[PDB]
């Protein structure tokens, strides 16, 4: 579903091949790859559907980024680095950990300087260790002057126009992601609009529309893994998650200079290609446009997801305990709505 | 569970016997019968638990009421009379009928003068017809002068004190109920506090506490039979309603001069005794006391019922269609909270 691997310029061969993609149980179809000047691209972003833009130059100055350059210039701030035994780096919200004492995270977060991160990578590589690391840090004003120049050299003209055109809210942050080959961020949805700017290496992105909520089984909203799918894509439990047999994804492989629009509330699964080396991405997260004063029916799928989130949140507050939300919901439906 | 039939004064024999009670699948225990001067009675009404008060004199002037007296004096207003093929007079909300076109009521409502109601009773009796009628009309200012005198002669001193003592809201109405022997009002709960004043004949009252919500399976809040149990007490469907096998009722038989406190949100099933003649009741419905400014946890069962009602109401309004509430609730729980 990703599509035929693109041929690199100057007869450099296929950028990647299918053997670097993980194997899953569901079909996919390709996300369109278009020029930012293509009116179809503007039609997909306006309809809140995904598209890969090949020529935005959004992060053109960062395409020279590698570990050496970043370590030399990214400053001496702290970087959040996640470590795991497994390739799956499931996100967890540490604030919500108090609610569920039973949950024990597969991955661990450690704060370190950028040179320490590079050192751990080298150490793991040198000893042939199985540990995996994923660096995930929002860009902030502690970065070095060269990085500031690169950041200023992003294509703000194009993306500010997009923000204005769509009525989106403010840019909330830019997340720097540096991963090891084979790293996976499991399926989840975010609440903000995202322009996903690939810099180094290749990432396979599998997206699912908001109307596949009933096939992805997100954790309860109060659980630390709120917004993530409960389904283990590598070993799906069809008895607990029967409608995962009905999921269909939208797939693409993004490379240096590609920008993927991940619309808000769209599920996405992101994996750095096997044996593809390290990957570098910077995303651009924007608050969604304000809800219109006059709500129009029929509601969009993501509006219904928002309703469900808000019901779960209200019940948790009203009952005084997040653990009680499940029992009350079952009491409400059993023999009444099922 | 009703208790031994009481012996009538002056050696008149048992007022009723067990053979006049319908047979059901669940156990019961008796509602306490106490004097209004008994501090235990005041303790049960303050804790919102049911009690039968034997000596309130609440409707003492109405104990002389029969069909002849009422027809002569109740005026020429219209009375709501319900007619049914079966003994079960399931209440339905006519405003909510638009939401469910499929629902067809077992009983029919007709407006008529009191003498027409007495005539239908006589006609049915004379021809030995199987039709059943239940008169259910709130008292209003069209009543005759003698009825006004009787109404004024109720024990307002005692019940106004109760209203003040419990912090209840206003008296909202007095419902006059005249039924045929064997008539049944199926299990349901009301949202208002109720003093249930028996006048003529005997009624078996089976009550269930609000915490048995999960065993009584009320209809959806937007369904015309909102607040009524879906379970057919005469032929319970344990596959759809498995926890009806766990219901336990509180039972009593009220007679002329008895007043039953039916606390708000308490389920009640009310049947006029087989072969006991017509029954006459007047109830006293009061708005519950205002919710306290500081909510205290743990929540009461009826507060959790109120939460569920309000969730169902909000979703119906938000989705724009009452039919969609069931599907969204299932989507929210399946594989997530069950």
């Amino acid at each position: 579903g990703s599509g035929e691997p693109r041929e690199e310029a100057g007869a450099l061969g296929p950028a990647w091949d299918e053997s670097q993609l993980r194997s899953y149980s569901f079909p996919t179809r390709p996300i369109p790859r278009l020029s930012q000047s293509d009116p179809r691209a503007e039609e997909l972003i306006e309809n809140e559907e995904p598209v890969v833009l090949t020529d935005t130059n959004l992060v053109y100055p960062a395409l020279k980024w590698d570990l050496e350059y970043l370590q030399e210039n990214i400053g001496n701030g702290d970087f959040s680095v996640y470590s795991a035994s497994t390739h799956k780096f499931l996100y967890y919200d540490e604030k919500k950990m108090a609610n569920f004492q039973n949950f024990k995270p597969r991955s661990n977060r450690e704060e370190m300087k950028f040179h320490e991160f590079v050192e751990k990578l080298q150490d793991i590589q040198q000893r042939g260790g199985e540990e995996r690391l994923y660096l995930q840090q929002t860009l902030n004003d502690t970065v070095g002057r060269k990085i500031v120049m690169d950041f200023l050299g992003f294509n703000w003209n194009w993306i500010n126009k997009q923000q204005g055109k769509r009525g989106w809210g403010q840019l909330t942050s830019n997340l720097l992601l540096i991963g090891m080959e084979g790293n996976v961020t499991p399926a989840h949805y975010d609440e903000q609009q995202n322009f996903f700017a690939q810099i180094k290496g290749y990432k396979r992105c599998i997206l699912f529309p908001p109307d596949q909520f009933e096939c992805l089984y997100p954790y309860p909203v109060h659980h630390p893994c709120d917004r993530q799918s409960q389904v283990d894509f590598d070993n799906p439990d069809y008895e607990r998650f029967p409608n995962f047999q009905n999921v269909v994804g939208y797939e693409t492989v993004v490379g240096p200079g590609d920008v993927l629009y991940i619309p808000m509330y769209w599920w996405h699964h992101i994996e750095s290609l096997l044996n593809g080396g390290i990957t570098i991405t910077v995303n651009f997260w924007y608050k969604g446009a304000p809800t219109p004063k006059r709500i129009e029916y029929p509601l969009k799928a993501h509006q219904k997801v928002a309703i469900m989130r808000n019901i779960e949140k209200m019940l948790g507050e009203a009952l005084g305990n997040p653990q009680e939300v499940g029992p009350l919901l079952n009491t409400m439906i059993k023999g009444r709505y099922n | 569970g009703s208790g031994e039939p009481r012996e009538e004064a002056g050696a008149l024999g048992p007022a009723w016997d067990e053979s006049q009670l319908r047979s059901y699948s669940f156990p019961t225990r008796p509602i306490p019968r106490l004097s209004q001067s008994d501090p235990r009675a005041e303790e049960l009404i303050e804790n919102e638990e049911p009690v039968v008060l034997t000596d309130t004199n609440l409707v003492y002037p109405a104990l002389k009421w029969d069909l002849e007296y009422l027809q002569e004096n109740i005026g020429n207003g219209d009375f709501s009379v319900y007619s049914a093929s079966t003994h079960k007079f399931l209440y339905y909300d006519e405003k909510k009928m638009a939401n469910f076109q499929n629902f067809k009521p077992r009983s029919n409502r007709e407006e008529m003068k009191f003498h027409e109601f007495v005539e239908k009773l006589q006609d049915i009796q004379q021809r030995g017809g199987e039709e059943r009628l239940y008169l259910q009309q709130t008292l209003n200012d069209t009543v005759g002068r003698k009825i006004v005198m009787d109404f004024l002669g109720f024990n307002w001193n005692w019940i106004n004190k109760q209203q003040g003592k419990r912090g209840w809201g206003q008296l909202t109405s007095n419902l006059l109920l005249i039924g045929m022997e064997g008539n049944v009002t199926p299990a349901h709960y009301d949202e208002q506090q109720n003093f249930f004043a028996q006048i003529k004949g005997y009624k078996r009252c089976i009550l269930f506490p609000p915490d048995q919500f999960e065993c009584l399976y009320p209809y959806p809040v937007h369904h015309p039979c909102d607040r009524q149990s879906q379970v057919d007490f005469d032929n319970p469907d344990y596959e759809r309603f498995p926890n009806f096998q766990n219901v336990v009722g509180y039972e009593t038989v009220v007679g002329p001069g008895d007043v039953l406190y039916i606390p708000m949100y308490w389920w009640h099933h009310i049947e006029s005794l087989l072969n006991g003649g017509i029954t006459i009741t007047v109830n006293f419905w009061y708005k519950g006391a205002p919710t306290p400014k500081r909510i205290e946890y743990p929540l009461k069962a009826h507060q959790k019922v109120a939460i569920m009602r309000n969730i169902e109401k909000m979703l119906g309004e938000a989705l724009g269609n009452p039919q969609e509430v069931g599907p969204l609730l299932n989507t929210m729980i399946k594989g997530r909270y069950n």
Binding site: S80, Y91, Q136, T138, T172, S173, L175, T185, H188, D190, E191, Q192, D226, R227, M264, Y265, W285, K287, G288, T291, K293, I295, L299, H302, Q303, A306, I307, R309, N310, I311 | M314, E317, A318
Partner: peptide, 14 residues
């Protein structure tokens, strides 16, 4: 309705 359809800004980051 407008209250219910409101959306947050939560993402996989602090």
């Amino acid at each position: 309705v407008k209250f219910l359809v409101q959306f947050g800004v939560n993402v996989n980051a602090a």
